[PDB]
Design a protein around this ligand. Structure first.
Ligand SMILES: *[C@@H]1O[C@H](CO)[C@@H](O)[C@H](O)[C@H]1NC(C)=O
Ligand SMILES: *[C@@H]1O[C@H](CO)[C@@H](O)[C@H](O)[C@H]1NC(C)=O
Ligand SMILES: *[C@@H]1O[C@H](CO)[C@@H](O)[C@H](O)[C@H]1NC(C)=O
Ligand SMILES: *[C@@H]1O[C@H](CO)[C@@H](O)[C@H](O)[C@H]1NC(C)=O
Ligand SMILES: *[C@@H]1O[C@H](CO)[C@@H](O)[C@H](O)[C@H]1NC(C)=O
Ligand SMILES: *[C@@H]1O[C@H](CO)[C@@H](O)[C@H](O)[C@H]1NC(C)=O
Ligand SMILES: *[C@@H]1O[C@H](CO)[C@@H](O)[C@H](O)[C@H]1NC(C)=O
Ligand SMILES: *[C@@H]1O[C@H](CO)[C@@H](O)[C@H](O)[C@H]1NC(C)=O
Ligand SMILES: *[C@@H]1O[C@H](CO)[C@@H](O)[C@H](O)[C@H]1NC(C)=O
Ligand SMILES: *[C@@H]1O[C@H](CO)[C@@H](O)[C@H](O)[C@H]1NC(C)=O
Ligand SMILES: *[C@@H]1O[C@H](CO)[C@@H](O)[C@H](O)[C@H]1NC(C)=O
Ligand SMILES: *[C@@H]1O[C@H](CO)[C@@H](O)[C@H](O)[C@H]1NC(C)=O
Ligand SMILES: *[C@@H]1O[C@H](CO)[C@@H](O)[C@H](O)[C@H]1NC(C)=O
Ligand SMILES: *[C@@H]1O[C@H](CO)[C@@H](O)[C@H](O)[C@H]1NC(C)=O
Ligand SMILES: *[C@@H]1O[C@H](CO)[C@@H](O)[C@H](O)[C@H]1NC(C)=O
Ligand SMILES: *[C@@H]1O[C@H](CO)[C@@H](O)[C@H](O)[C@H]1NC(C)=O
Ligand SMILES: *[C@@H]1O[C@H](CO)[C@@H](O)[C@H](O)[C@H]1NC(C)=O
Ligand SMILES: *[C@@H]1O[C@H](CO)[C@@H](O)[C@H](O)[C@H]1NC(C)=O
Lengths: 336, 27, 339
């Protein structure tokens, strides 16, 4: 039996050498072209244990996206461990592209195709792939954006549901579009719009899935973040090179008893807590013009308070869970 | 473990090398 | 429920301030006196999951014994990362004493009292203790010495039996005494004696337990180490402050189908050792004169199984990572935060 193994995974993408956008520039040097001849092979009569919570693929992707950001988005000033660095901090073009992860010779990527697979334990429908599907490396909190949808129904996953410290990764089966804009011509004022009925419908469906997990006798409540760094109190993300911090109170205030768009007030910030490592970075003020991103919300990161009522709040922070939300169906094994 | 030297020495023995804590173990 | 948590464990012991033996000296400064008023409380109707393979108590003990050795046994020369240090390297008195680990305020040590508990999963007989039982921090390979015996029968434990890369920790239920001596008046030549019939009986009983795990149709073979550092190819240990490397071929060459009363293992006292504390090498001074002798209870073993067909499983002596030594005693314990 092929054993799980850590190796040198390589990336593949449709990056273009003539595209100055920073993911493209990074991928042009770091990645090969997307597999022109993909091959999925069903492994008949194989059952394989997976563990999405202990998957080195996640650590590898994390290191790569850290490198992409570090090379691409230069802050004017950076503070880590009481030491300050300053450097040129030009504005850049920034729009994530799908990155595939591929196993080199001697190794295989196993993929779990069981429907509503919870992320750990035995998988009875296993295939090998040369590379993963293309994953856009979106760095964000609270909401998972532009990812892959669940096929049949919403799925919730946790390393341990009974442990209130463990993040719950929600995988939606229907996307909710969110359009975030800093309008052309307060240069830091921005907003996001999304369908109210679609969002409410989504919360209602997640609540059902949480009740399945925690008990039919439970009443499910969503409440806003309990506090901490602005990056995790707000839905934070990068749009067009600018760091958006969007107030998500309206997204996460809900119970099962009760305009047409939800509008989230946002701010573009120059001084951010870094996700790559503990420290702070300051960037230049916003570029001029319309700054706009239209994204599919495809997942959520939640925490549960713990203590007949269960309260859930937006979470995230560790971007490894973002990568995990896409990598959960894969593992790398050594062919022996 | 010095994993490479471990792999080096065990390879010479016709075996794989792996750390056993801070020691080299041949397989 | 109360959650597993990492805290600042403190140690307790019967160390004496007047005893210059190095564990005693270390414990005199690092530990408190053994609990004069131990209290074990049964937690009625409580089932608790344990995971001996991910227990921070193990990491804490490991760091403590590293510190004990680093303070106590100074090599004349030490080579790490291509850098050399040299220093005074006095000979010392060395005989491990039992150390207890205790939880401070706000935390509790849970103990699993299920018989033949395999180390992971639910325990139905859980108690709380203020401190662990007294554990002698014996640093050794292949054989576990002066430890705690299983109560009713041999138990084998692994993080994953089907994974041939994972060490198998054997807990015996009957000790086998092993006497190791460098005779008074080749100063580096030593040997170990143990009962042949007792050792053979032990291998036979372990084999039965391995068969239980791997399949009745399997034939069980023990073979010596496949190689590597001498520390793990031999049964290595410290006796009287000297590093003994004992050839264990005779202990680990066995099959089911079969004179002398005692097994005599040839040993050497070595001055140049691969360190267990950290990757590097150290040189100590030549052995003291006089009889150097230790009589120990073999209470466990560390084994590896050869990966894969065809009907046969081969087991070899292993060890190396001293965390498994600590784990062999700490497997019934975990620390939780009282919340
Ligand atoms: C196994 O999964 C693959 C991929 O989704 C699917 O095409 C196939 O029908 C599945 N097999 C069975 C027996 O369900
Ligand atoms: C997920 O599924 C596995 C196998 O069905 C099960 O053992 C586990 O308890 C489930 N819940 C988890 C992993 O949180
Ligand atoms: C968002 O989802 C739509 C389908 O609703 C799809 O056509 C589009 O490509 C998705 N966008 C991204 C960035 O994945
Ligand atoms: C999403 O899941 C729900 C509940 O299972 C189902 O009714 C709905 O059709 C699904 N939507 C899509 C687009 O698959
Ligand atoms: C899940 O977390 C709870 C609460 O910390 C803990 O009691 C339980 O042992 C955990 N379950 C597993 C399987 O580790
Ligand atoms: C988002 O933008 C698309 C076009 O980019 C538009 O069709 C849709 O109505 C917008 N949604 C909201 C909530 O503004
Ligand atoms: C589940 O619901 C029943 C019915 O209300 C209640 O009596 C019981 O205490 C609940 N159990 C837990 C663990 O909350
Ligand atoms: C977020 O919006 C709510 C209103 O929905 C407001 O009470 C709160 O002050 C806002 N948070 C911040 C940090 O401004
Ligand atoms: C989501 O994908 C769309 C299409 O590439 C892009 O316009 C948008 O900026 C993306 N959102 C984020 C947050 O990267
Ligand atoms: C639980 O374990 C303790 C300690 O070994 C023992 O004294 C007691 O009899 C056990 N209880 C049961 C019901 O086995
Ligand atoms: C060894 O075992 C004997 C009983 O067989 C016991 O009396 C003695 O205290 C043990 N010694 C150590 C160091 O554990
Ligand atoms: C150890 O377990 C065996 C079971 O094979 C038993 O026969 C033996 O009596 C036990 N040891 C002692 C000292 O009772
Ligand atoms: C420990 O015992 C449990 C049953 O309580 C079992 O599920 C688990 O596999 C055992 N551990 C190992 C390493 O086999
Ligand atoms: C045990 O190890 C084998 C071999 O690597 C692996 O196939 C299996 O999934 C492992 N079991 C668990 C529960 O991780
Ligand atoms: C070990 O020494 C003890 C006394 O210290 C003695 O009774 C026993 O027979 C010895 N065993 C061997 C194998 O020499
Ligand atoms: C260990 O002893 C055996 C004899 O049983 C011998 O063949 C072997 O060479 C010895 N090992 C070393 C390193 O001398
Ligand atoms: C079996 O063991 C005997 C002595 O223990 C040994 O001479 C023989 O070579 C071994 N053969 C096999 C096939 O195990
Ligand atoms: C085992 O314990 C006995 C009694 O304290 C001691 O004489 C002997 O040196 C110990 N063995 C080791 C290897 O520490």
């Amino acid at each position: 039996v092929w054993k799980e193994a850590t190796t040198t995974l390589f990336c593949a993408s449709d990056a273009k050498a003539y595209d100055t956008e920073v993911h493209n520039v990074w991928a042009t040097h770091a990645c090969v072209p997307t597999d022109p001849n993909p091959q999925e092979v069903k492994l008949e009569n194989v059952t394989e244990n997976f563990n999405m919570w202990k998957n080195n693929m996640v650590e590898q992707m994390h290191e790569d996206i850290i490198s992409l950001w570090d090379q691409s988005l230069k802050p004017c000033v950076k503070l880590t461990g009481g030491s300050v660095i300053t450097q040129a901090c030009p504005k850049v073009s920034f729009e994530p592209i799908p990155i595939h992860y591929c196993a080199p010779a001697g190794f295989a990527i196993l993929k779990c195709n069981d429907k509503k697979f919870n992320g750990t334990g035995p998988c009875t429908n296993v295939s090998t792939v040369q590379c993963t599907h293309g994953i856009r490396p979106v760095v964000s909190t609270q909401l998972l954006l532009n990812g892959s949808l669940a096929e049949e129904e919403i799925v919730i996953r946790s390393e341990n549901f009974t442990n209130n410290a463990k993040t719950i990764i929600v995988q939606l089966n229907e996307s909710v579009v969110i359009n975030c804009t800093r309008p052309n011509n307060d240069i830091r004022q921005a907003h996001c719009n999304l369908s109210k009925t679609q969002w409410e419908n989504t919360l209602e469906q997640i609540a059902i899935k949480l009740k399945e997990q925690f008990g039919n006798n439970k009443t499910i409540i969503f409440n806003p973040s309990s506090g901490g760094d602005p990056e995790i109190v707000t839905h934070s993300f990068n749009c067009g090179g600018e760091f958006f911090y969007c107030n998500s109170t309206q997204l996460f205030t809900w119970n099962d008893t009760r305009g047409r768009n939800i509008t989230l007030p946002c701010r573009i910030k120059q001084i951010i807590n870094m996700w790559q490592e503990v420290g702070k970075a300051m960037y230049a003020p916003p570029i001029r013009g319309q700054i706009r991103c239209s994204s599919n919300i495809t997942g959520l990161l939640l925490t549960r308070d713990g203590g007949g009522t269960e309260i859930f709040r937006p979470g995230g922070g560790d971007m490894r869970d973002n990568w995990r939300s896409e990598l959960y169906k894969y593992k790398v094994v050594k062919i022996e | 473990x010095n994993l490479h030297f471990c792999q080096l020495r065990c390879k010479s023995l016709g075996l794989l090398g792996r750390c056993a804590x801070t020691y080299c173990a041949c397989v």
